[PDB]
Amino acid sequence: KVFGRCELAAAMKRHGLDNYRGYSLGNWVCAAKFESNFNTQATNRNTDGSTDYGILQINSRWWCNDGRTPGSRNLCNIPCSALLSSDITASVNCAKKIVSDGNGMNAWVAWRNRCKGTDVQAWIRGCRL
């Protein structure tokens, strides 16, 4: 499923991400835009053989099991395929664990390079939330 901007914002807000660990909703929508273009089915292979999955491009080296990333951790205790569902619950619950681990949203390279320090509130402008 490819989300619209306000649709995803409303979905993330209902799942408790607005101001989660101090990150306003616009940060999460901005990260999703540049990580996956709002597409729950996005996958990208990394140089180390791991793969990023879903709307927030969660990495199989640490966070989910895809059966082909040797020596990887499964810290969200989920198959990576569950992160590709049109229901974002699994991706959001896993993202909450990632953003709480110490580095905040700097774990998402696209957020660091394209959202951090910008007017991220623009990403929820006009949405009925």
Ligand SMILES: [Cl-]
């Ligand atoms: Cl915001």
Ligand SMILES: [Cl-]
């Ligand atoms: Cl980037």
Ligand code: NA
């Ligand atoms: Na959903």
